[PDB]
Design a protein around this ligand. Sequence first.
Ligand SMILES: NC(=O)c1ccc[n+]([C@@H]2O[C@H](COP(=O)([O-])OP(=O)(O)OC[C@H]3O[C@@H](n4cnc5c(N)ncnc54)[C@H](OP(=O)(O)O)[C@@H]3O)[C@@H](O)[C@H]2O)c1
Ligand SMILES: CCc1cccc(NC(=O)c2cc3cccc(O)c3oc2=N)c1
Length: 316
Amino acid sequence: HQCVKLNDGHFMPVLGFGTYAPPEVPRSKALEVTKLAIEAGFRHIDSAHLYNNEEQVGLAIRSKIADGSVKREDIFYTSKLWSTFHRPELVRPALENSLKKAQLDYVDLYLIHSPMSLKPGEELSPTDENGKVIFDIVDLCTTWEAMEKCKDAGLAKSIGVSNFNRRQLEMILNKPGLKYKPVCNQVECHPYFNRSKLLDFCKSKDIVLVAYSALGSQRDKRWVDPNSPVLLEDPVLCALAKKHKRTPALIALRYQLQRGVVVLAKSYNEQRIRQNVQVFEFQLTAEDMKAIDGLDRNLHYFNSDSFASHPNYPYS
Ligand SMILES: NC(=O)c1ccc[n+]([C@@H]2O[C@H](COP(=O)([O-])OP(=O)(O)OC[C@H]3O[C@@H](n4cnc5c(N)ncnc54)[C@H](OP(=O)(O)O)[C@@H]3O)[C@@H](O)[C@H]2O)c1
Ligand SMILES: CCc1cccc(NC(=O)c2cc3cccc(O)c3oc2=N)c1
């Protein structure tokens, strides 16, 4: 039920449903599970142009509005501007296209998906003849201006960023004629990478930290090294789960909630979708918090080193 107030005065529900699924999963699944997530109790729905599912997710949202389950105002829907669209003149059309695909009039939240700008084209990851991705050099403050223009148009209620570090955040915050702060910064966050310093920064600036891969990544072969620790197998989360008679995933999500982090949970399984909303049903002790805090290994699951060269590469 709980929401946090955003620095533009809108409210963001603190538990969000992640909708990304690999290309293998049929697109119809995005429709089904998103309706399930809404039926379960989620009111915050995270998507993006990249995820190739905005048609299905928007259809689920429209279906739940139209069967009378919720109203548009109950749903907090997030889309993301992809990095082939960072040139300012490309920002508003991308949003419009996302809206046309999702069949909604506005998103509650529009994010700059990543700081590292790509070559503009009809392709989503443009690669040259050797298969290397072609970068673009764009001053992200101009991207931000185009984002602010989307806010004034009513196309996005709130605007924020994702995968930005301290430097990129303050580069937006120092911006001359800044009309709107980012309400939020959506970054990878879980017990093996808690972002305690980044989070403290944000709390100072009134920017919500939004955790993704907060259950430990879906562990795609393409992006994640399978030898990395499995977060939901962690001994301390398994211990706390048996102690509270919950599950490791519930421990992880509650961990974020109690340290003031809005947390995303992806699940395409109906039982886990309905289980994840029990995060509001129990609390961890300050000592449980301490023991999870102690798991921090500054561990990225998303291996991005073919982009280290990028001037805007987030964690240099
Ligand atoms: N801004 C960014 O760059 C960025 C990057 C990555 C992700 N995201 C967003 O964050 C969302 C979530 O992150 P994510 O995709 O990395 O996945 P995640 O939330 O870390 O979840 C990972 C896996 O945990 C499993 N799981 C879910 N609930 C569970 C439970 N109660 N018990 C045990 N296992 C459970 C799910 O498998 P089942 O489906 O089988 O349950 C899921 O595939 C994404 O869907 C996307 O919206 C954003
Ligand atoms: C300058 C563009 C650029 C350059 C280098 C890396 C990236 N990052 C990604 O490939 C992403 C993968 C992804 C995957 C699943 C869900 C997401 O939400 C994701 O988000 C991403 N940004 C972007």
